[model samples]
Target chain A: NMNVIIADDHPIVLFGIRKSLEQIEWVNVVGEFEDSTALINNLPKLDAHVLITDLSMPGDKYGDGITLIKYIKRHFPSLSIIVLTMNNNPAILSAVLDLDIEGIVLKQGAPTDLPKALAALQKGKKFTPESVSRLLEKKRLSPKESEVLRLFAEGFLVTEIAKKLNRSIKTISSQKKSAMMKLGVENDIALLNYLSC
Target chain B: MNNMNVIIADDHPIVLFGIRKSLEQIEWVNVVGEFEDSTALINNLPKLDAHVLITDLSMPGDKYGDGITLIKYIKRHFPSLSIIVLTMNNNPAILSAVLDLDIEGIVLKQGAPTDLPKALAALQKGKKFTPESVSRLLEKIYGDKRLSPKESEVLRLFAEGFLVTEIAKKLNRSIKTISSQKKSAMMKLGVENDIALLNYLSCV
Candidate 1:
């Protein structure tokens, strides 16, 4: 039997996942948590082979988004994690890719994919749904492009960014313009919109 | 006696509490719900008979959306619901993007505790409210108060701690031209002295 744990802030989703997993005899549901704090608190004590969680759990000590994932990944490298999330934003998708997380199941299709995802995890294989794969397949920025755009997205002025990066204002502006072009955004505002996720 | 119903969605617990506390001071404004996730807010939207929706832009939750997507959805479904965006993101690009939306107010999270009541009152009267920072940013985009390319360069160098003489040497311009550019930038930025000019340059 595979020991599985689940964490989701939504009561309904949490209950649904529990109900769905209970139907499978080979799977032993060890724990279900509503927030990251509870999950973090009980992580060492709860012996689970697979950890299923939502990408965002607000009102948590570690934070709700990518930061929490980083924390979990750092602490539980041995434990397999399957992220069930509603966020499909490209910026988040790119950030997740940087962390090189293995399994991601969108909440919209989780009902259908969770079984397969679990089965895949049990086999020591990763499962990434078609939609998430599409996001992952999107064009990635070069390191410099990402660096420039990330600074811009954070509300840094080009001149100030240039100073910070120890580059000329002209160089920063050109890099920003080039990054915007690569992203296919017409203007800074559109670039910001594209990156705000 | 007009009772204004309000709803707020922010991911941070402390921010939600701060917003609620601020709204409590306004006797006629009733907070219908405070949600920590966009998904929760959208799920409860039908049940909340809120007159105004005060939301943070970069909230995480559910697949529904974040700042822009959620704002667009709310405007599409509830055309009558006044929106006041209370967010920590002060990006001019983001400000410009959201300003194009049908939002009635924009309050920076840094200033929300003090500004929410004022924003709520203005929105109640069908008047738009935005902080001075936002006003300046919008003006920078659309208004004539924008610094010229040369002036901007001069101001940037000044902000980067380059002396006027040093800036003149770097730009290959005379001290007179650089000095004039500095003076022009100071006037354009509406600052009286070098201290204020430097502050404005660093801020904007």
Candidate 2:
């Protein structure tokens, strides 16, 4: 059985989520917490196989929302993460994807999406509900990613840019990967001419 | 299962006192709170420990927007609370619109004394309460209203929560083009606002 723990500020959402989880017999909800501090502290001991968490919560040193998600990942690298968020910002949604989390379920679609997200995770695949995936497709290239693409257009490789910008090689590489994915540029040839196109 | 502390909102003292007593027969319903307008009702809700909210279509301020807008806001803000709208509006499009908002009950102001107990009884059994008038009216409201291909196309995306700009980007059209098509579709479908369009698309 998958040991799931959920956190949300709203009790109603938590109730609905638990009720929904009841339908999937293989899942067992091990714990429920309302705030980041409770979740972060209780997480390690719960032996949770899946964490269905919201982005926003009462704050602590770990921070709330995406900051909290980052902290959780840093502290609990082995745990699978599924973010059930109300945030609709394309930039924010894309950033969540950048973190390489297993599931992204928007709160509006949570009832239907939660089960599907868990099912996909059960098979070792990542999940984004249809509306979310559609939202990401239209997310315009960020200036942040475009900065990396512009350098690629200048024939500067990621290795040179990492030292030039004082960021890691992986950071530059991720941006380029994100940049080209948004622009539908498949290879170095198209990426080099991205600015002209 | 039948116990519910209800808060009713309407501009009429007549409804505030009148419906409270009328709803008294339910025996399970207790009038814990009351409001005469939208703002007071909304302001009170954050702290109000209410299980059910009875609202009127047109309040003094219409502060939020249309009655439909007010209902939509409340549903999103307090998903757990049951809503029963007592409205004088018999306009099939409007009556049908409130039902789509997942309103627990719609008691026509003209028909409340007769429909109220029935609606409450239905709710007591955990079923959604829609009057026969609304049931028949929705059937008539459904067909004969047609949207243009582009208008329908634009609306489908908008209803799915895409902004007009995003819909335009996806469909290879101008932003203005998508906006007008969605608006025109709303007009044709008797949809007064965005929430109505979203609900309408779900019905289709």
Candidate 3:
């Protein structure tokens, strides 16, 4: 049986996958983490063949998901990764792709398609929902930082941006100022103008 | 079929009006009450049979940035009450604390008009509701271990106890840019006020 670890903030999504995985004889879902910190804390101890993580788990103030994957890849380079998420945005997809993920399953599109997801992962092939491909047209290694910059330009407040970003307020606040400076904008309006130019 | 009684708590008049209007679309969604102050909202929370209590993080209340306390109050008194945090902005420190409290939904002001409906639905289902933008933000923050070059510079200025204006001059950026960075840094520091931030910086 292929050992797999599933991490997601939504319990319903977790439950559906858990039940489906139980039906699969070849897959052993060893553990699950609800947030990024929890997953990071336990990743070292958990023995699994595949690491399935949600792209937007809590406490991921600075591309926490990618950070987790990066850590896991550093430690267990051979382990495959499958990212499950409701977000099909090109920017996020590109960010996760840069993490060298093996599988990308849109929760809304492939709610019960974990087996197919696993199949693609085992084959060392990238699998993503066909519809989501269009969003990835402008796929660039913008990283999560650039997106944060644009979100700020959209007039999202530091604290508000943190909430949307699923990070510690401190981390978001710090990142916002940093992003402002990086984008060479004085205020949110300036940031917007910069984005346009 | 129970009516989804909700309380829209916000100090801004236009925002309050916008949320109220959003609720009007749903036939079973009842607007039991509305509030502008944190104290008044907290005081009347017990009286209102609000299944969902929508509030902002920062308000011009008796105690500013005490929205978390109100969240705890509703959770204590109205145990199944869904709390949806509607904020003008997102701060990681504040957001993490609230999410740990197990809030049902978190909606941003920028995306409120379009995304709040999904957030409300998620809250009603007792699911953890967070915007995609918020999710991506979490990813960005946790993904990179080290601070960006700019963040490192701002943090150094803050640690050195530079005033916002002074830091602006030193960094060759505008005072407005400095102010924005300072505010964001304070949130990152998880301090309520600049004084609080000062205290935090001294230790770290």
Candidate 4:
């Protein structure tokens, strides 16, 4: 069987979701745990090739957040994830995209979302349903902002994008400032994680 | 009219978005879609309303590759669409391979934003254009050498007085793997021999 392992910080959420997955003919939920600790601890032993992880930040020892996913990715790069979350915060979505976690099924997603996610993953493709994607685009980057960020990403000097765009240096600088401010990133290391997805 | 429909493929989502933003400023150009891999690019090209294909030269496959094979496949299968390549630098070795493929245009990734528009303008006029950047490859090597961590480690060990076999044994990799990694780094760095690589490494 193509086994899937699931973990959530809460049992109330985990058990209910586990029952729903049980009904899918193409899926086999071999393990279900309530904490990121237990999930990571037994992942190697169970040979769970696919993971359906919780986005809630209430786990014991190894708690949930970007760090938990980062550890899981670092340790088990082969595993695929379909992260289940309750919110669609642009910052969080941007962070997860940086980690290359493609499938993001909201808690309020339609009944067919998990099915569509598995189907796409099976095809070596990806899924990011509209509720999440639409919100991210609704607060999307402006063309000037993305252009400035692009030049910066390519290691262009400060005057380069402005000179290329035929704009004032002050305009280019301010757009970059406003862009970074919009993403809530203060430095290159943070933007490296936040922007270059 | 924004009549020229274009599709771009890249391994990096950020680059694809960057290209899209660059194209959006052109009143006569429309970026139809951006695919992140060769497979998606080839599979979904017909589905989109695109007249031009702008693709990165080095992207991983989902069955389709990105160099000559990708160019040949597209030229043979989709003869009507124009092909534009995105390159990191004007490395002669890589560019020569791409230049032979009869592509419509080539743009350096780090070139000015105007260069992309200029390429498109040339393509629209049915002429091929490749940006003539500087030939000093030292900076290019530093920027886009793209050496893997394993290769960097092996290169370091070789410089630290280790033979290929010793490095292979110590790193727990096969001799072939070690040699290949070293060779790959040398090729990427555009160095012909160990002494040259050492010289290059010293500068790097």
Candidate 1 scores a C-alpha RMSD against the true structure in Å of 20.8
Q: By DockQ, who's the top model here?
A: 1
| Candidate 2 Cα deviation (angstroms), residue A149 | 19
Please give the distance, in angstroms, between residue A24's alpha carbon in candidate 2 and its true position after superposition. Answer: 0.4
| Model 2 docking tier (incorrect/acceptable/medium/high) | incorrect
* Candidate 3 wrong stretches, greater than 4 Å: A1-197, B63-65, B142-204
TM-score of each: 0.47, 0.39, 0.38, 0.36
By lDDT rank, best first, the candidates go 1, 2, 4, 3
Q: Model 2 over residues A27-71: C-alpha lDDT tens digits?
A: 999989888888878887898888999877896667787778887
Give the CA lDDT, 0 to 100, for residue B127 in model 3.
Answer: 76
Write out the backbone clash pairs for model 2: none
Task: List the global CA lDDT of all models.
Answer: 0.74, 0.73, 0.67, 0.71
Better of 1 and 4 by DockQ: 1
DockQ-superior candidate, 2 or 3: 3
> Per-residue lDDT for B1-204 in model 3, tens only?
778888988878888999888878877789988887877887787787788888876554544224565567667767878888887656543455567677787777778877787787776676778889677654544123444567668766654434456678888999887777666654443344433333333333
* DockQ, cand. 4: 0.01
Q: Could you give candidate 3's per-residue lDDT for residues A1-197 as a string of tens digits?
A: 78999888888877888886787788888887787777767777877889877766786543465566677677788788887765444445566777777887766545566788887777767777654453344212246677576555433566655756689888876766676554333444333433433
- Model 1 docking tier (incorrect/acceptable/medium/high): incorrect
lDDT per residue for candidate 1 within A1-197, as digits (tens), equals 98999999888888899887887789999998888888888999988988889877865478777788888888888888887766444455556777767678777667777888899887778888654565456544678778888756644567656756789999888888877656555556445645544
Best prediction by TM-score: 1
TM-score of chain A of 1: 0.79
